[PDB]
Write an enzyme that holds these catalytic residues in place. Sequence first.
Site: not given
Ligand code: SB2
Length: 334
Positions: A16-17, A18-21, A36, A131
């Site tokens: 998807i996208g 201090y690491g990776m999601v 994440k 933020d």
């Molecule tokens: C401002 S930014 O770049 C940013 C960074 C990470 C995330 C981001 N982090 C998470 C994410 C995943 C698991 C966790 F438990 C907590 C957060 C997600 C996520 C959660 C649920 N479904 C899909 C994706 N996206 C969002 C915004």
Amino acid sequence: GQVFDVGPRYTNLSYIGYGMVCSAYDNVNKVRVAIKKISPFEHQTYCQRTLREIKILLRFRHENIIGINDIIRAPTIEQMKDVYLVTHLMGADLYKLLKTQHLSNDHICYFLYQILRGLKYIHSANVLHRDLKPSNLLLNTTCDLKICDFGLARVADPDHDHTGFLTEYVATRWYRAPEIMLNSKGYTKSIDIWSVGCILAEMLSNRPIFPGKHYLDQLNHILGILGSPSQEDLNCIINLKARNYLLSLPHKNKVPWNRLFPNADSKALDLLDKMLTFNPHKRIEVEQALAHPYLEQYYDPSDEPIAEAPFLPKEKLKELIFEETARFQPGYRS
Ligand SMILES: CS(=O)c1ccc(-c2nc(-c3ccc(F)cc3)c(-c3ccncc3)[nH]2)cc1
């Protein structure tokens, strides 16, 4: 890409996208989740942000805020290099959505309501997100909105809010309130209301309202639309350098909201005006925002919950993160 061992329980990983999601399949609850990976232990600052977020997210229980369903890490502090946070999948976010989709007034109204409903809970817990922006607002296929990214979040401290002129700031520039570049550390709730106001404006035109290219240009953008601050507003700025900078600027007139957004709902523009007020003391609060005529189709204070309980070396922080994530370990789970 790199190691992402989330255990046998989570399979079918898609990036998807201090690491990776990443997206994954939960073999137990039978749902597709989002995980994440965080690798923060090498730095104190990264650990502080991580602990801070984990603590906040674990205490918070709200429909419009990302909740942590599981946390994956090693059985010991020695073996713990990475930590994995798990939550329900939300396939999109407002940033991605606003890049190609024009929002109907109904969607803008529903999104704003969910943002404010979630923000109400965050603030009742004496916490500030600090933020808020479109990429932090996650959406699923049915339009449910959830706030995430509490890395820059802090406990509210109004009494220690003042600082000097041009004081460096951490949060995303385009959503920074004017007082941040003038005399504020961002320790007041009004900081989040401004960001939400910027988000609303962005939802109305699919474009950021104040896209400053650098620190000071951000203020130039804000004053370009709001116009010169009144004498009353300048009197509330006791810092000489900040007040004098404002006074040195040529008179700028306010650009009418209905001129900037000619196809927007008039009630939406009235609420936008109240959220994008120069003076933080006069800025509308989250509960007033919810009670505004624009959201009357959704307003129900009894269904807008508040928090039950309001809110160091890298080694000790790593230890705290370990102790904070201990409740998700297979021991008591078995
Ligand atoms: C401002 S930014 O770049 C940013 C960074 C990470 C995330 C981001 N982090 C998470 C994410 C995943 C698991 C966790 F438990 C907590 C957060 C997600 C996520 C959660 C649920 N479904 C899909 C994706 N996206 C969002 C915004």
